[PDB]
């Protein structure tokens, strides 16, 4: 029922390359989970989706989390998607811990099962040695990945740029079927 | 439309689900509007094949397909392609069954019509014209005139609609007698449609006048409904409308206001004086504002009106046309009374051979001499002998007023012949029983005529005895009046069985005005008169007020 949660991390690593990926992957963001981008309201219909944004650790004395998307009403999403600012270990683990918490709250609130998906878009191939140190959860990258793969059957898609670093080979560790490997250059797919 | 609607629903529809299915017999639209507007948005989006077909109905999904108490018919069909199930299932016109024998009483307003207004525009409007285009061969099958006429918001939003309807019905004056559709709405428009906009009522008055002029009405001798509607129309606007309305009928008296109905014009100008009296429209100027009505007076004066001649001139706060009042030649210079009496005697004598020449004698009948010959009849124990009764019921009702003009004075003479009471009892026992057979005159012109030429200086103090004893005697129907009073105030608009009610009522006491009462040697009735007959005595219910005024307020002198 189109219960998605975006994860933007390449805001500080690669700024200008964001539009190059958006112009190609904006269709799966809206045109797949809806008819198209219009001017409409939102409700508990389940179609709502979120988007968390993060930056590197150097440009962060106090500000780490900005997960601001309760419902997004299927249109204000792309509206503030171009409005966020654009600014090495980019703290991807603490950035994914909040997405895991958001999915947990979804599963706790969406009781009366919507094939959840998430895009851990990271421009650079970063890595966060400290687990969270900023939230209730405390788990390393491997622990967070196996927890997001086992608990949630969400399609852990990794929409990285045209690069192919060693991040994909390690972040494809989703043991249940989640399609963590694809970096889709050809025509858009449903969720993979 | 969608922007503000969605912005308001984002704040109004703050909930979690779609509760309250709301069967809601009396008031369901208030709850179902949130889903109806959503369905309309869905249809508007699907018409363009975009906007995701107006998504997000989850807060109203239960009410979405609620289609599957007759008041649960939520008419969500206004969008498109749904005017078959809700509307078609409604109580439409009669088709199965066929005289006032029509089945299927009509619908109540507050039940369903409180919401199905912006959806029903040209359904009945085209249904009636389709039924009327070819002919009204059989008796009128539907009786939906109650619902159609009891639609005040209909004429509030589409006042021009009924004007267009009447204009498209106008060609029927050539189709067939303009009968099956004129006597359809004209009655209930006067009786049910009480409160209406006046700027259209003046146009309807002009149309009624040119109707009474054209076309012919000899077969429509039951056209008294036309005069009753005209009276109701010209007696209700007297508050303040004529002064702003003058610019509308500036040329109306110059073209059509004075065809034949001179008594209607007398009542019209009486009400016009009454209106100029409210409030003090003449104390300021006497000739400056004079031209506002002097044109109407000059147009009317070509037809010997205002015959009152200084006796009845009491309602005018400044009687202006009363300056030229001597131009009325009342009773033809006060000498032709006995002369026309002798002429009536000679006509009663020539009745011995007027039979074979009745066709050449009824041509204009020497207008104010012919139809009073019935008076000598019924004085010799039904001396009519049906010689020309069928001929008498042809065109006589028009000139009957001119006939009774001098006969008012003659009857005053017959009354004063008592001089103590010797002739009084004879007159009471003869005249009151003989006038009743047979006529429908119902004093429709005698009250005006009494002030025309009888209340003059001839026997004014004695012709004022008319209202004292002439029409004070009729008491034949007062028995059933006591039960006929309890039909409209107990049910203002709560009528569910009005059809059969008035059907049985008019089946009990009355038969018709064309019909006779005596079955003499030959009487071919030939009844065709069954267009529509919902009201029979509410017509005199209003003209009782002009009598009430000429008897007290207008004739306040004596």
């Amino acid at each position: 029922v189109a219960d998605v949660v975006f994860v933007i991390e390449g805001t500080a690593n690669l700024g200008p390359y964001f539009e190059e990926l958006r112009k190609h992957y904006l269709l799966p963001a809206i045109e797949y989970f809806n008819g198209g981008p219009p001017d409409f309201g939102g409700d508990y219909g389940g179609t709502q989706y979120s988007l968390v944004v993060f930056n590197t650790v150097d440009c962060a004395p106090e500000s780490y989390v900005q997960c601001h998307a309760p419902t997004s009403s299927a249109y204000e999403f792309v509206t503030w998607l171009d409005g966020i600012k654009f600014m090495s270990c980019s703290l991807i683990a603490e950035g994914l811990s909040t997405a895991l918490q958001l999915f947990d709250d979804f599963k706790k609130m969406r009781e009366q099962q919507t094939h959840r998906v998430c895009l851990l878009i990271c421009n650079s191939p970063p890595y966060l040695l400290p687990a969270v140190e900023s939230t209730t959860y405390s788990g390393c990258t491997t622990e967070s990945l196996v927890q997001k793969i086992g608990e949630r059957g969400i399609h852990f898609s990794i929409v990285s740029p045209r690069k192919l670093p060693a991040l994909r080979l390690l972040f494809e560790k989703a043991a249940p079927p989640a399609l963590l490997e694809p970096l889709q250059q050809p025509a858009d797919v449903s969720q993979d | 439309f969608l922007p503000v609607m969605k912005l308001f629903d984002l704040l109004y529809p703050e909930k979690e689900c779609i509760p309250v299915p709301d069967i809601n017999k009396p008031q369901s639209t208030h709850a179902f509007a949130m889903t109806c507007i959503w369905i309309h948005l869905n249809r508007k989006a699907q018409n363009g094949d975009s906007t995701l077909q107006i998504p997000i109905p989850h807060s109203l999904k239960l009410h979405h397909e609620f289609l599957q108490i007759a008041l649960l018919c939520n008419a969500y069909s206004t969008n498109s392609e749904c005017f078959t199930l809700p509307m078609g299932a409604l109580v439409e016109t009669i088709y199965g069954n066929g005289a006032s024998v029509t089945p299927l009483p009509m619908n109540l307003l507050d039940s369903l019509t409180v919401h199905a207004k912006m959806s029903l525009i040209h359904s009945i409007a085209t249904r009636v014209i389709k039924l009327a285009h070819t002919k009204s061969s059989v008796a009128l099958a539907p009786a939906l005139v109650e619902t159609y006429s009891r639609l005040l918001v209909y004429m509030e939003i589409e006042s021009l609609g009924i004007k267009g309807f009447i204009s498209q019905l106008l060609p029927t004056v050539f189709k067939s007698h303009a009968w099956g559709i004129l006597h359809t709405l004209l009655e209930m428009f006067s009786h049910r449609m009480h409160h209406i906009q006046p700027h259209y009522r003046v146009q309807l008055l002009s149309h009624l006048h040119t109707l009474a002029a054209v076309a012919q009405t000899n077969q429509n001798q039951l056209h008294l409904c036309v005069e009753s509607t005209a009276l109701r129309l010209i007696t209700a606007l007297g508050s303040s409308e004529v002064q702003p309305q003058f610019t509308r009928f500036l040329n109306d008296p110059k073209t059509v206001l004075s065809a034949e109905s001179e008594e209607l014009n007398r009542a019209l100008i009486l009400t016009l004086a009454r209106a100029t009296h409210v409030t003090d429209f003449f104390t300021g100027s006497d000739s400056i504002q004079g031209t506002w009505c002097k044109d109407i007076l000059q147009t009317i004066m070509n037809f010997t009106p205002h015959n009152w001649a200084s006796h009845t001139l009491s309602c005018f706060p400044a009687p202006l046309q009363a300056f030229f009042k001597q131009n009325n030649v009342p009773q033809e210079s006060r000498f032709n009374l006995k002369k026309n009496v002798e002429e009536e005697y000679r006509k009663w004598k020539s009745m011995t051979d007027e039979n074979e020449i009745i066709t050449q004698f009824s041509v204009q009948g020497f207008p104010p001499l012919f139809l009073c010959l019935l008076w000598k009849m019924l004085l010799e124990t039904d001396h009519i002998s049906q010689i020309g009764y069928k001929v008498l019921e042809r065109i006589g009702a028009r000139a009957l007023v001119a006939h009774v003009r001098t006969f008012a004075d003659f009857l005053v003479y017959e009354f004063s012949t008592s001089a103590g009471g010797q002739q009084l009892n004879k007159c009471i026992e003869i005249l009151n029983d003989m006038v009743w057979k047979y006529n429908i005159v119902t004093l429709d012109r005698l009250i005006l005529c009494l002030a025309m030429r009888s209340h003059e200086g001839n026997e004014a103090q004695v012709c004022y005895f008319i209202i004292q004893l002439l029409l004070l005697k009729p008491n034949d129907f007062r028995n059933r009046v006591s039960d006929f009073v309890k039909e409209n105030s107990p049910e203002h608009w709560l009528q569910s069985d009005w059809h059969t009610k008035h059907m049985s009522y008019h089946k009990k006491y009355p038969e018709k005005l064309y019909f006779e009462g005596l079955a003499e040697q030959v009487d071919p009735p030939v009844p065709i008169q069954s267009p529509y007959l919902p009201i029979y005595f509410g017509n005199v219910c209003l003209r009782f007020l002009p009598v009430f005024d000429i008897v007290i307020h207008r004739f306040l002198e004596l």
Side-chain angles (χ1 to χ4, degrees), chain A residues 2 6 9-10 12 15-18 22 24-25 28-29 31-33 35-38 40-50 52-58 60-61 64-70 74-75 77-78 80-81 83-84 86 93-106 109 115-119 121-122 125-127 130-131 133 137 139-141 145-146 150-153 155-157 161-172 174-178 181-183 185-187, chain B residues 3 13 19 21 26-27 29 31-34 36-38 40-43 45 48 55-70 75 80-191 193-558:
Chain A
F6 274 52
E9 207 76 16
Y17 302 154
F18 192 91
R22 171 189 175 183
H24 278 255
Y25 304 145
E31 293 183 355
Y32 170 68
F33 302 109
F40 285 95
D43 80 325
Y44 205 68
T47 312
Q48 70 263 13
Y49 40 92
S50 178
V52 61
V53 173
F54 266 79
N55 289 315
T56 76
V57 308
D58 55 70
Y64 278 112
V65 287
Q66 52 258 69
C67 66
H68 54 276
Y75 177 70
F77 179 85
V78 61
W80 63 71
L81 202 63
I84 61 177
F86 284 147
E94 211 271 331
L96 194 141
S97 194
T98 192
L100 187 147
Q101 193 70 60
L102 195 71
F103 273 115
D104 169 74
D105 270 311
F106 284 165
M109 72 98 76
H115 59 75
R116 283 82 58 199
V117 300
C118 82
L119 310 191
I121 296 183
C122 316
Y127 62 98
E133 210 174 343
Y137 266 70
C140 200
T141 42
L145 283 175
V146 301
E151 174 186 0
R152 307 258 60 84
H155 300 183
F156 184 65
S157 297
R162 202 255 175 275
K163 318 167 53 175
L164 279 178
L167 181 138
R168 184 258 296 190
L169 267 299
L170 193 43
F171 275 74
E172 63 94 23
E181 44 173 354
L183 197 151
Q185 286 197 11
Chain B
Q27 41 181 354
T29 302
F32 282 170
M34 286 288 195
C36 201
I37 190 172
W38 213 243
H40 274 104
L41 291 178
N42 281 114
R43 180 57 171 86
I56 313 297
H58 166 272
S59 315
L60 312 94
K61 56 189 177 301
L62 191 150
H63 305 159
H64 201 101
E65 212 68 22
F66 205 74
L67 58 94
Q68 282 303 134
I69 299 177
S80 63
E81 211 64 30
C82 315
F83 283 136
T84 315
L85 171 83
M87 312 308 182
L90 297 180
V91 187
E92 304 299 313
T93 73
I94 293 91
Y95 287 144
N97 308 94
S100 310
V101 76
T102 288
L104 203 73
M106 301 327 295
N107 171 36
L108 196 145
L109 256 59
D110 204 17
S111 314
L112 320 180
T113 319
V114 77
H115 184 31
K117 310 175 301 180
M118 77 305 292
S119 44
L120 200 153
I121 295 91
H122 64 286
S123 67
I124 292 182
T126 72
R127 179 65 203 87
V128 56
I129 68 178
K130 186 187 72 64
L131 188 138
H133 272 315
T134 167
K135 53 195 59 55
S136 87
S137 43
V138 287
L140 267 298
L144 82 168
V145 287
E146 192 70 33
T147 290
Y148 183 36
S149 293
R150 292 266 205 168
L151 267 172
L152 300 97
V153 296
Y154 198 110
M155 271 65 88
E156 186 185 25
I157 196 61
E158 202 67 18
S159 158
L160 277 298
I162 187 171
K163 198 185 85 61
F165 183 35
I166 296 173
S167 47
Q168 274 78 81
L169 294 200
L170 275 175
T172 307
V173 310
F174 318 123
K175 288 266 189 169
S176 60
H177 294 316
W179 201 358
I181 51 173
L182 260 56
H183 285 50
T184 308
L185 60 89
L186 188 65
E187 288 79 358
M188 294 315 219
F189 164 66
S190 87
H191 309 109
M193 178 45 61
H194 280 283
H195 171 264
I196 208 178
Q197 207 263 350
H199 194 99
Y200 175 57
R201 96 170 64 248
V202 53
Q203 204 79 8
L204 196 143
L205 177 62
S206 46
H207 280 71
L208 272 177
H209 191 78
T210 179
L211 184 147
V214 171
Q216 84 289 339
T217 53
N218 60 92
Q219 56 271 42
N220 186 13
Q221 203 63 75
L222 74 160
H223 73 116
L224 61 91
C225 310
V226 188
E227 277 84 6
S228 181
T229 54
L231 188 75
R232 279 191 199 76
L233 200 53
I234 70 187
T235 317
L237 79 165
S239 45
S240 159
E241 179 55 40
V242 63
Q243 163 70 23
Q245 204 72 251
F246 149 77
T247 78
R248 196 73 271 165
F249 53 80
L250 167 62
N251 320 127
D252 211 333
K254 290 196 291 291
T255 77
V256 294
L257 258 183
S258 83
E260 209 283 327
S261 57
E262 200 70 18
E263 308 86 6
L264 191 65
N265 296 330
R266 201 70 74 96
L268 179 149
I269 197 162
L270 196 146
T271 314
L272 195 167
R274 185 180 294 170
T276 45
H277 206 73
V278 289
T279 291
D280 286 88
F281 273 79
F282 277 76
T283 57
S285 54
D286 206 10
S287 199
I288 302 89
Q289 207 184 322
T291 77
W292 179 94
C293 176
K294 279 174 171 58
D295 46 356
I296 309 179
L297 262 299
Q298 190 59 42
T299 51
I300 298 179
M301 56 88 68
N302 315 319
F303 308 86
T304 173
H306 308 76
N307 306 116
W308 300 299
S310 277
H311 195 187
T312 313
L313 273 303
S314 193
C315 192
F316 304 171
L320 310 185
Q321 67 91 26
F323 303 155
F324 305 146
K325 64 163 67 64
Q326 283 45 71
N327 49 18
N328 63 323
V329 301
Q331 292 183 4
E332 302 92 25
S333 315
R334 270 309 304 124
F335 209 101
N336 218 326
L337 164 76
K338 276 80 63 177
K339 308 315 285 183
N340 64 60
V341 168
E342 293 157 337
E343 286 165 355
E344 290 156 66
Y345 294 170
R346 298 318 300 171
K347 293 296 183 299
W348 170 251
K349 296 285 103 176
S350 45
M351 192 183 175
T352 56
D353 57 352
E354 85 184 12
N355 183 28
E356 56 263 19
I357 205 179
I358 198 171
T359 61
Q360 297 89 358
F361 189 42
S362 279
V363 297
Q364 305 305 133
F366 299 143
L369 295 87
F370 196 14
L371 275 293
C372 276
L373 261 60
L374 169 61
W375 188 261
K376 288 303 181 183
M377 285 156 257
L378 281 86
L379 259 66
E380 312 301 326
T381 309
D382 195 42
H383 209 269
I384 176 161
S385 316
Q386 62 99 55
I387 296 307
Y389 196 54
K390 309 159 189 175
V391 192
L392 190 144
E393 215 176 15
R394 287 180 59 256
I395 48 180
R398 300 155 181 79
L400 203 44
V401 52
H403 293 113
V404 73
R405 264 175 167 86
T406 189
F407 189 76
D409 191 13
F410 195 38
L411 193 150
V412 174
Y413 174 81
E414 292 277 359
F415 269 37
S416 44
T417 319
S418 305
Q422 49 98 49
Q423 189 48 42
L424 183 45
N425 51 355
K426 173 72 170 178
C427 295
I428 300 302
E429 70 196 280
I430 288 298
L431 281 63
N432 302 316
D433 306 341
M434 75 91 62
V435 290
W436 284 333
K437 178 253 164 175
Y438 271 141
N439 200 338
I440 188 65
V441 55
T442 62
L443 57 97
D444 284 319
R445 292 164 181 96
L446 189 61
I447 289 306
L448 274 298
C449 201
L450 208 67
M452 291 210 178
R453 287 173 171 85
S454 43
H455 280 149
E456 311 315 311
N458 42 67
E459 290 163 347
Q461 71 289 330
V462 179
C463 312
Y464 189 40
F465 213 68
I466 287 302
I467 320 182
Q468 180 164 359
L469 276 191
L470 184 57
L471 70 160
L472 214 68
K473 182 55 181 58
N475 44 9
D476 71 331
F477 192 61
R478 58 171 175 80
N479 55 4
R480 201 158 265 170
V481 171
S482 63
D483 200 12
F484 193 40
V485 298
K486 47 185 74 58
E487 268 85 8
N488 210 321
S489 160
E491 264 179 351
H492 171 276
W493 184 218
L494 285 79
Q495 286 85 308
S496 44
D497 194 275
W498 165 269
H499 298 168
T500 82
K501 183 74 60 55
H502 88 88
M503 276 154 197
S504 60
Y505 185 86
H506 91 275
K507 187 53 184 177
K508 282 186 286 287
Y509 158 74
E511 299 173 354
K512 212 156 292 185
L513 65 93
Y514 294 73
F515 289 169
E516 309 187 2
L518 290 184
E520 59 268 17
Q521 58 177 56
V522 60
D523 280 315
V526 195
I528 303 94
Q529 296 87 63
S530 64
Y532 269 160
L533 291 94
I535 291 92
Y536 313 88
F537 292 146
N539 45 7
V540 193
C541 166
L542 183 55
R543 203 189 175 282
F544 187 74
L545 195 53
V547 184
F548 198 75
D549 211 304
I550 300 296
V551 74
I552 287 309
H553 159 262
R554 185 76 145 112
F555 198 79
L556 188 43
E557 316 92 350
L558 317 172

